[PDB]
């Protein structure tokens, strides 16, 4: 179809609204902004009212299907917004979506919002049914590498001058929380109409609202950033994440890394990575970890992880975060 990014949808929308729009991504802010832009353009082009339906195992598909053929007594045009579940569609929902796609017409600016679909969901009848003229917008969260560029670009968009230090601080405090990041940018613009947000001007108006997953901590350990790892642990603990899943992902990737380090003296790193099915984006990070980490450090990490799991699984679970921080520090030397 037409696959675009949030910075391209604004230009695309002035070329004429399409039959359907699919907003795919894990970032709530990008999805919200793209949906708002689509709705504003639709209102400009004559779409007055809008209908919202969250897809649930108890979705009133008859109501929405009637809505496809529901005309407008006092209104003229109409949109139709669908909120996909966190796991995406299945057989029944995809069949319903195929029927809805068959029900599109001049009206029905069908809008689809949710998280990115998998390759299996990619190869589906409904997806191919609107595969000629629909517009798909990718709305994934920028990662650690591209976050400073993204926040600088948005600050330029919002007529705000930002420094490198302020960009780093905003990326640090609101990583994975770009909703709070945009709210912070708006707050800083409101508090200071000058727009020159120096480092002290942003240090006094931000709070540690960043959200992380266990994989973020695993990658921080592999890169060796002790401070980032400890920050991720603090954020995960304040969020209330169960330490067991952290220990599980740590165990899985640490066992894989121990196998790699053991086999390094036998087979080159490329073939070892290939055999163990290592993703390309993390091969350099894991090779750096293998180079930095010694066999003694790996044995000590395994020992500490085993002690931590034994402490947890014996129904005590007391001060497991201290042991996790100890392991994090140990793996970053």
């Amino acid at each position: 179809m037409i696959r675009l990014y949030p910075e391209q949808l604004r230009a695309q929308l002035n070329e004429g609204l399409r039959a359907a729009y699919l907003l795919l991504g894990n970032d709530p802010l990008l999805l919200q902004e793209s949906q708002d832009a689509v709705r504003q353009v639709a209102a400009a082009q004559g779409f007055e009212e809008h209908h919202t339906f969250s897809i649930d195992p108890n979705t009133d598909w008859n109501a929405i299907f009637s809505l496809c053929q529901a005309m407008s007594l006092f209104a003229s045009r109409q949109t139709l917004l669908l909120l996909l579940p966190e796991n995406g569609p299945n057989a029944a929902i995809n069949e319903q979506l195929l029927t809805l796609t068959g029900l599109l017409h001049d009206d029905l600016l069908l809008i689809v919002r949710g998280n990115k679909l998998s390759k299996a969901q990619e190869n589906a009848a409904w997806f191919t049914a609107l595969a000629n003229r629909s517009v798909q917008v990718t709305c994934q969260t920028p990662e650690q590498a591209q976050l400073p560029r993204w926040v600088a670009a948005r600050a330029k968009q919002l007529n705000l001058e930002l420094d490198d230090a302020a960009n780093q601080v905003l990326c640090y405090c609101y990583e994975g929380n770009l909703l709070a990041l945009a709210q912070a940018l708006e707050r800083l613009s409101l508090l200071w109409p000058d727009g020159k947000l120096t480092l002290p001007r942003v240090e006094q108006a931000v709070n540690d609202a960043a959200h992380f997953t266990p994989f973020h901590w695993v990658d921080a350990l592999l890169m060796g950033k002790s401070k980032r790892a400890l920050h991720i642990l603090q954020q995960l603990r304040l969020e209330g994440s169960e330490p067991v899943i952290l220990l599980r992902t740590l165990q899985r990737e640490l066992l894989l890394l121990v196998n790699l380090k053991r086999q390094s003296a036998h087979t080159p790193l490329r073939a070892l990575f290939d055999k163990h099915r290592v993703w390309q984006n993390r091969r350099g990070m894991m090779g750096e970890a293998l180079n930095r980490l010694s066999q003694t450090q790996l044995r000590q990490a395994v020992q500490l992880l085993t002690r931590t799991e034994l402490t947890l699984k014996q129904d005590y679970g007391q001060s497991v975060w201290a042991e996790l921080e100890g392991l994090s520090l140990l793996l970053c030397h």
Partner: protein
């Protein structure tokens, strides 16, 4: 002879009487004066920081005959009816009381009906993070398109449990825990207006013991006045804070490191008078030593949990070689191992501290 509680008698009535949170007050004033008020305001701070006070003041600004503004008036009808807690359409809800999706739905059936008085129908939900996920989703669904005169005010101590999607619907404010200076100045003003004799050192002790919360400072001030017959001297506050002291493990570590046997004995006897379990004391001593070792490894090992005693912890990390930390940790580990079979554990913990002091 009223002698009412100083906590609520001194709740702020105008925005100029709120200590700290200056950026939040400026943002609220700017939204009330020139801009259009956002359809939902969420507040997140610490215990006794000002959240509900700020929300109530904002609701007072919303409903008033002078109009929607920052500093509306004094002693008006709506402002007084809010200050007395008797306002009709200023709904006050505890989220924990109505976590059920059915009760939440019943609460959200009231938004359609027009306000009885004023302009805006204001809902004030406390500890909003405790709402169930279904109730939270219903709240978001009613927040996306609220009525033109219906507004929501939400407060929570820990916003980390709130899903990120709440940021998509409401404008959030974070209130910074007050420092020693602001709390001390506000307590000084309160005591000066109430004609309470006091000393600056007593105020400093109260502020430091408050740990950032002004409600804690006011409660401690009330206790100090009650015990001291209004004469709030340094010695009175110091003694009554020592009665409430629970930093025994940290002081034990500090004194045992300094090879101060008499100090350790006095502190352990005080802990015995406190009726503290000895196994818990020893395990938290082990935790303190482990934290010292970790912050020695890297300055970032510390967090905000120990942000009350972080100064002494930094000094301990700076001054104590890691070998001494390892020796002390081993000594306390074997002491905890041998504690159950020892005599009455009040003396087993003592003798474990003895063994620790032997490494001098």
């Amino acid at each position: 002879m009223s002698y009412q509680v100083l906590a609520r008698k001194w709740r702020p009535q105008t925005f100029a009487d709120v200590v700290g949170q200056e950026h939040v007050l400026t943002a609220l004033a700017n939204g009330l004066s020139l801009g259009r008020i956002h359809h939902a305001y969420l507040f997140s701070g610490t215990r006794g920081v000002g959240k509900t006070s700020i929300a109530r003041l904002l609701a007072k600004g919303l409903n008033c005959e002078t109009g929607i503004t920052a500093t509306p008036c004094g002693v008006c009808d709506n402002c007084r009816e809010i200050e007395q807690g008797r306002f009709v359409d200023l709904i006050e809800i505890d989220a924990a009381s109505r976590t059920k999706v059915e009760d939440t739905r019943d609460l959200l059936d009231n938004v359609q009906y027009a306000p009885a008085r004023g302009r805006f129908k204001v809902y004030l939900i406390d500890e909003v993070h405790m709402l169930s996920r279904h109730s939270f989703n219903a709240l978001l669904k009613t927040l996306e398109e609220p009525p033109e005169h219906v507004k929501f005010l939400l407060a929570t101590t820990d916003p980390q449990k709130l899903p990120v999607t709440i940021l998509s619907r409401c404008l959030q404010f974070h209130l910074k825990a007050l420092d020693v200076e602001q709390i001390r100045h506000q307590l000084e003003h309160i005591l000066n207006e109430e004609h309470i004799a006091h000393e600056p050192r007593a105020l400093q002790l109260l502020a430091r013991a408050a740990e950032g919360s002004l409600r804690d400072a006011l409660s401690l001030t009330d206790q100090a006045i009650a015990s001291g017959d209004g004469q709030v001297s340094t010695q009175a506050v110091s003694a009554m804070l020592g009665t409430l002291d629970d930093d025994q493990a940290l002081s034990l570590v500090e004194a045992m490191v300094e090879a101060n046997g008499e100090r350790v004995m006095a502190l352990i006897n005080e802990a015995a008078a406190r009726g503290i379990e000895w196994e818990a004391l020893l395990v938290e001593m082990l935790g303190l030593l482990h934290r010292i070792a970790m912050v020695q490894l890297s300055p970032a090992a510390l967090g905000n949990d120990m942000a009350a005693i972080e100064l002494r912890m930094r000094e301990l990390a700076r001054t104590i070689p890691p070998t001494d930390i390892q020796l002390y940790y081993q000594t306390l580990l074997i002491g905890r191992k041998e504690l159950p079979y020892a005599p009455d554990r009040r003396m087993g913990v003592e003798m474990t501290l003895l063994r620790a002091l032997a490494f001098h």
